[PDB]
Amino acid sequence: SVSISGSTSVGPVMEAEAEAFKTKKPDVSIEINQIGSSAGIKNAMEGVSEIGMASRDLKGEEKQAGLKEVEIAYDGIALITHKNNPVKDLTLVQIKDIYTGKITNWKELGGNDAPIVVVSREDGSGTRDAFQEIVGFKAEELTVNSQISDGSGNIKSLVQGNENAIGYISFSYVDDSVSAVKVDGVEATPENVLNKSYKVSRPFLAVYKEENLTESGKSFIDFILSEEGQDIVAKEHLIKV
Ligand SMILES: [Zn+2]
Ligand SMILES: [Zn+2]
Ligand SMILES: [Zn+2]
Ligand SMILES: [Zn+2]
């Protein structure tokens, strides 16, 4: 009964939210399709979904379609490497140099003599948008040798599968199978996003048209914002608020 689509970064928390909400409102069903931020935003603009989930802010034109926004969490973006890469700390400008193809071998960062396998998300990813904005490069500048992975799960799998890969992903997906680098000497933790020392972060938004949001969908968003819903955000390695 409540259709939600969009961000892959938001998918794990939204699924957790839905299952917990099922105990509060058993007669509501929440349908979640993880297709990336831009597509979920467009589905909300077009009335295809009741709620869009985004992991970037709206563009002015998306806003103009009459979309309200509700911030449900903040989220860090980790730069992940394969486990046991000797490079454990990068400055934002080093990251920019990698993603624009200026630096191409891990030795240029003090690592192994090996080519860097640069991994980017697909066009329309909210993580890609925020990452590029913060690191400080345009889509035009992304190295032509970048692999493109479609969705959070795929970027993690690529990095898991290649010793020399580097990718970016929501903290929600980071586990012991990959290594998040320090950024500018700051560990990639929800605590350091909260205290503003970890610089790569972005909101999670639920977006909707007031005309389309049902009492069930409003209920669900209110639950996510509740004390219990915000504990679920924290458990998914996000930042409350
Ligand atoms: Zn906004
Ligand atoms: Zn390995
Ligand atoms: Zn609590
Ligand atoms: Zn976990």
- 56 alpha carbon to ligand 2 midpoint, in Å? 32
Q: Measured between alpha carbons, how far is 6 from 84 in angstroms, rounded to an integer? A: 33
Determine the straight-line distance between the first and last CA of the chain, rounded to whole angstroms. Answer: 26
Q: Rounded to the nearest 5 degrees, what angle is found at the Cα of 9, between the Cα atoms of 6 and 14?
A: 70
Q: What is the resolution of this structure in A?
A: 1.6
The size of the chain, in residues, is: 241
- Amino acid identity, position 115: P
Instruction: Give the method of determination.
Output: X-ray
| Ion ligand 1: residues, CB < 5 A | 57-58, 69
| 219: exposed, middle or buried (Cβ count in 10 Å: 0-12, 13-18, 19+) | middle
Q: Which DSSP helix (H) or strand (E) runs through 95?
A: helix 92-99
Backbone angles phi, psi at 37, to 5 degrees: -55, -50
Map residue 66 onto helix, strand or coil: coil
- 176 alpha carbon to ligand 3 midpoint, in Å? 26
Q: Measured between alpha carbons, how far is 128 from 54 in angstroms, rounded to an integer? A: 12
- 237 alpha carbon to ligand 4 midpoint, in Å? 7
Domains and their CATH numbers in the chain: 1-75+203-241 (3.40.190.10), 76-202 (3.40.190.10)
- 73 alpha carbon to ligand 3 midpoint, in Å? 15
Q: Measured between alpha carbons, how far is 184 from 101 in angstroms, rounded to an integer? A: 20
Q: Measured between alpha carbons, how far is 84 from 82 in angstroms, rounded to an integer? A: 6
> Which neighbouring-strand residues pair with 119?
147
Q: Measured between alpha carbons, how far is 211 from 66 in angstroms, rounded to an integer? A: 9
Pairing of β 117-121 and β 67-82: unpaired
